[PDB]
Nucleic acid binder design. Structure first.
Lengths: 262, 177, 206, 143
RNA sequence: UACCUGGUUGAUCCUGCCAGUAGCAUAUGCUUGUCUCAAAGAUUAAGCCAUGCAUGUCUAAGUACGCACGGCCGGUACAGUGAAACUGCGAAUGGCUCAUUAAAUCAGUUAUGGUUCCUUUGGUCGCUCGUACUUGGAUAACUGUGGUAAUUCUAGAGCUAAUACAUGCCGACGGGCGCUGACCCCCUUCGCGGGGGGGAUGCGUGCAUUUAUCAGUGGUGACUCUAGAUAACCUCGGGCCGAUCGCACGCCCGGCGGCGACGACCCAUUCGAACGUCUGCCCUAUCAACUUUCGAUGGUAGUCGCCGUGCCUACCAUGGUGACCACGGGUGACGGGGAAUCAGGGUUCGAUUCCGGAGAGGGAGCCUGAGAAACGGCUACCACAUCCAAGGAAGGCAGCAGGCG
RNA sequence: AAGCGUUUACUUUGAAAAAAUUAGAGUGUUCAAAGCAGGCCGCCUGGAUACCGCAGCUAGGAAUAAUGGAAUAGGACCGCG
């Protein structure tokens, strides 16, 4: 092409959005922002397909132009804003706060949180920069460039920022034995404790994470997000709790619940 | 075909013309197109000559100098109003702006005044106070955050010096061992 | 125009690459600057990304650095003597990167006579009639004379450098890219570098 | 010795015209557990394309080859044997791709048939994208 | 479902091919009641096109003196819609086709530590030491004269606006830091000498770029990485330090204030783009040697480029590839994810809705713009082709329908 | 717990490998081809999973197929002048 793209096809849309084929040729292309292309879920899909509040994209535009949806500290007036992992969407009139956490499957979950939890969120830092006056800078996954940090923070750590002021409160250092949220790949939606770290000079490192039920699995470092220290997470967890049990066990849990409900 | 200054011919010349040149209005932003113009030398191969009387002679023509056409628009910038009416920097401009009467059949007679652009108003004064207040807020935020980071770096330096003293004490224990 | 492309020419083995596309805009090639010595004529060129480069076309001044004491001065270029790239760049006086030029030594002489309080150049027989450098060399106080003497102790100059300051023109290598950023800066040659370039100039002259 | 070209030969990092009352040589680590050679630090030459005393960094891949041609200056031609498996005919075949690798002058005891270790870098010429990192002597032939 | 049958002979058994057998595509003939989906000018002509449409766009938040509507509460400019227009952005997205192209495109894996990057988001934006209660003149829309047969052709006269174009300081701003440093003070020595402080004048002292030196806050497997100090420049075809706009309204005794919007020098993030590392592609020997001072393979030093490179230049060495099929030619070859047949193996198709590449009849060149060698952008040649008053003007349906062949 | 270890071909595990399509869980589009839907007095939910040739990274093995040690001895090893 002779420049950057502006459209996105419905077939070329990623799988975790779970869009349908019969309706449209194009898919809502996410705008430029804190998250990538195939790692976020747009506000129009979150409002129309998941919550089923509105019906059409014009109604989604009306909802976002009445200044009702307040994403993580500032009201965005765009229908295709990239809402990725660890984003707090605050709706004022319904009194409901939503935290974008992955489900145990590839999709996200409609995860309701209290306002006391919605006041903060957790974000993994990506790199440490030195500004023009010898000032340390943390660059996170959601592009939050926060300067003058706590010097204990390293490359693969997480920080607990406050939404009302944009400053850090606490931090989790990458240690062995901490919890983990696998944010990408075939293990998208797994929760377990970290049991091994394997470094690689030149090549890309790997982390063996053990599940709480005893299912150890390896994961590359590009899709790892720690969520707490030891066995105490600092977020609220959705149902399923990041296990990925077998399909026969899922069939059993469906059939027993169906025969118990009637 | 229109004329062109400086091409300096007597026939018909095709030239590239872009934005900023005479006899060519651009359509796309930066569009260039060959156009056909004539030289700046006046000959008999013409139709209409444009003439501007600079100095008026002795006699009075009844076609041009008899009927005087007034100006259509008045001044809009307050500095141009001050330059026209020879005003100072303290007297009023709102009472001295040029307003136009409007009259026609059916409707009532009206009088319309233009919106004065670049006039000193308390809204512009509030914005001028606003951006320097934002400058003050930025400098105060930098001072407070630099002081907080100085306290945090002093605490980290104290605990790092304690760790270095513990390491040197461990080295002394290994030397005594 | 001219295109920068690795597909317009032959393979490693010797076959011909047949063109599967035409020339592109990212394969941009522009003509040379070929700047001269004269009044400052620097044009601007919009480049890829919306930035601007600076083409020198005639340029005489240059902020040249002396590295044994690490001080630069804005110095006018008067002659081009040696260029390892092309003999035509010596024949026609054209400034490119890594040229050996003759530069004025009077700001370095003024800095040396103001700092170290020692005569520099100054062939025997002449005295300064405006008396300004004589005032700058004389009239010292009591305790600052120790500092001037400690400067005088560490003011040894080389023989070839002293001969070049006596002639009044120094040899400077153009280190900055002149046709890209517009500036034509460089550094004054010293030591084995100056001996190698003077040997090459002597081999050129014969 | 050195400096047989038209221009002056020096390293862009070190400075050599300091106030005098051996020239300082710049070298650097290369990574991936490869040890630096002694002669790259001990020598008096320069090379702007040397992976130890030059402005080039080893990235990407680290591969191996066998030396078959040394007729070029400051660079050699290696040979790479590999076996290709066709899914239909369940056998192998001999294919070779003889890339040109910049032989750094920190190694001198280099003959043909020597197994050499190459590393990906920026393209220094039209067909050279690799530096010589370490040289292993061939099987036998101590003399 | 890992499947056979007839045919050479007077008759038999083989090899052997032909004919049957069943699908998936393309066309054609006959016939046709319902309903749900549904391919559809690709194969020959990437041949040529009449006609009409396909990219234009305003919010209370850049410009509003066209009564085109319009309220009376006016003399303290503009109630509020608002045609047309300047400006900003898009027009480099999307649709079509596979012409070209055989280590090329493309598929898997990598790095940009060798580069750019609109918008959005997050950091910056009294850090600089020398009319600001707001700087200057040009123009569109408008009034009027029109030239031409005709155009999205435009000009002279009278104006008028900027978040279009240039200039540009007040405030912080009183003292810090390095220098020249007049001069002064204290102790000791007979004296020169030696040791320790204060200080007049002036200069420089923000971010970004260029030159070189010294030392080595924070990282990478690895910098000539980020950053500190040192001596200057900061391209007049100048780099930022707001000479912008909208809504309710408050606190002092003229000074202070909110919610936003827009534009911006630099560092990140994202969409990417492009160069690179390794492996993989149909047939042909009636193609065995190919490339090379018209760059072929490297080195040195430069030019251009956004960056690395013979991409190109000046000089040196004669190198580089190949029977493991290079080089040359052909393809009814764009590549892939895929489709059909299928025991296992394979065979054929893939132009086609998803991704990447190429382009608007064939090449070449450029402005704008962050992004184009763009063609519902221009500029010259070849081929085709429109109106003409015979002077001239104007075009690119391998887009949507539609017309000829 | 960190680093090194004679090199390959081979073999086993693990990440990365875009969707549609291929097989396949669930669902009464009246069945089916399809689609990702629907049932109960706001909730339950799902929208999985498998294949993904070839090459490359990493972690164990050394049977098999190469590859060489030292033989005019400038052959290893612990130590000295």
């Amino acid at each position: 092409a002779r420049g950057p793209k502006k459209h996105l096809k419905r077939v070329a849309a990623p799988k975790h959005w779970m869009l349908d084929k019969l309706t449209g040729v194009f898919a809502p292309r996410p705008s430029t922002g804190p998250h990538k292309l195939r790692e976020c879920l747009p506000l129009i899909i979150f409002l129309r397909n998941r919550l089923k509040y509105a019906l059409t994209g014009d109604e989604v535009k009306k909802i976002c132009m009445q200044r009702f949806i307040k994403i993580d500290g500032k009201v965005r007036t765009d229908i295709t804003y990239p809402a990725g992992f660890m984003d707090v969407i605050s709706i004022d009139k319904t009194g409901e706060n939503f935290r974008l956490i992955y489900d145990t499957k590839g999709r996200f979950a409609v995860h309701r949180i209290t306002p006391e939890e919605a006041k903060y969120k957790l974000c993994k830092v990506r790199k440490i920069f030195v500004g023009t006056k010898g000032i340390p800078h943390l660059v996170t996954h959601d592009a939050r460039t926060i300067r003058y940090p706590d010097p204990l923070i390293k490359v693969n750590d997480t920080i607990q920022i406050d939404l009302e002021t944009g400053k850090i409160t606490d931090f989790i250092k990458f240690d062995t034995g901490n919890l983990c949220m696998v944010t990408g790949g075939a293990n998208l939606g797994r929760i377990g404790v970290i049991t091994n770290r394997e470094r690689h000079p030149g090549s890309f490192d790997v982390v063996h994470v053990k599940d709480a039920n005893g299912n150890s699995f390896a994961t590359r470092l590009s899709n790892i997000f720690v969520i707490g220290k030891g066995n105490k997470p600092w977020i609220s967890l959705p149902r399923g709790k990041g296990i990925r049990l077998t399909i026969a066990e899922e069939r059993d849990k469906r059939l027993a619940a169906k025969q118990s409900s009637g | 075909f229109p004329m062109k200054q400086g091409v300096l011919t007597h026939g018909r010349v095709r030239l590239l013309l872009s934005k900023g040149h005479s006899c060519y209005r651009p359509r796309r932003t930066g569009e260039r197109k060959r156009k056909s113009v004539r030289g700046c030398i006046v000959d008999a191969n013409l139709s209409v000559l444009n003439l501007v009387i600079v100095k008026k002679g002795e006699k009075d023509i009844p076609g041009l100098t008899d009927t005087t056409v007034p100006r259509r628009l008045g001044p809009k910038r307050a500095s141009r109003i001050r330059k026209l009416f020879n005003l100072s920097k303290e007297d009023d401009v709102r009472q001295y702006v040029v307003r136009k009467p409007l009259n026609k059949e059916g409707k009532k007679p009206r009088t319309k005044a233009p919106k004065i652009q670049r006039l000193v108003t308390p809204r512009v004064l509030q914005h001028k106070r606003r951006r320097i207040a934002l400058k003050k807020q930025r400098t105060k935020k930098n001072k407070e955050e630099a002081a907080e980071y100085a306290k945090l770096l002093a605490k980290r330096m104290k605990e790092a010096k304690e760790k270095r003293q513990e390491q040197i004490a461990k080295r002394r224990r290994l030397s005594s061992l | 125009g001219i295109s920068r492309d690795n597909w317009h020419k032959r393979r490693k083995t010797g076959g011909k690459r047949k063109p599967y596309h035409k020339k592109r805009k990212y394969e941009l090639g522009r003509p040379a600057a070929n700047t001269k010595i004269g009044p400052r004529r620097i044009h601007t060129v919009r480049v890829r990304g919306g930035n601007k480069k600076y083409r020198a076309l005639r340029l005489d001044v240059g902020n040249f650095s002396w590295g044994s004491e690490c001080c630069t001065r804005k110095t006018r270029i008067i002659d081009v003597v040696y260029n390892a790239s092309n003999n035509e760049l010596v024949r026609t006086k054209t400034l490119v990167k890594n040229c050996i030029v003759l530069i004025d030594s009077t700001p370095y002489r003024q800095w040396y006579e103001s700092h170290y309080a020692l005569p520099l150049g100054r062939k025997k027989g002449a005295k300064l009639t405006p008396e300004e450098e004589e005032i700058l060399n004389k009239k010292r106080s009591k305790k600052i004379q120790k500092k001037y003497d400690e400067r005088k102790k560490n003011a040894k100059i080389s023989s070839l450098l002293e001969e070049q300051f006596q002639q009044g023109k120094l040899l400077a290598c153009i280190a900055s890219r002149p046709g890209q950023c517009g500036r034509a800066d460089g550094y004054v040659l010293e030591g084995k570098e100056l001996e190698f370039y003077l040997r090459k100039i002597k081999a050129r002259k014969g | 010795d050195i400096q047989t070209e038209r221009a002056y030969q020096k390293q862009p990092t070190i400075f050599q015209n300091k106030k005098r009352v051996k020239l300082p040589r710049y070298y650097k680590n290369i990574g991936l557990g490869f040890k630096t050679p002694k002669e790259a630090i001990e020598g008096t030459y320069i090379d702007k394309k040397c992976p130890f005393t030059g402005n080039v960094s080893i990235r990407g891949r680290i591969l191996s080859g066998v030396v078959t041609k040394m007729k070029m200056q400051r660079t050699i031609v290696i040979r790479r044997d590999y076996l290709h498996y066709i899914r239909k005919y369940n056998r192998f075949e001999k294919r070779h791709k003889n890339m040109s690798v910049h032989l750094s002058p920190c190694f001198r005891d280099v003959q043909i048939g020597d197994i050499v270790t190459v590393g990906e870098c920026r393209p220094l010429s039209k067909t050279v994208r690799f530096n010589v990192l370490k040289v292993t002597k061939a099987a036998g032939t101590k003399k």
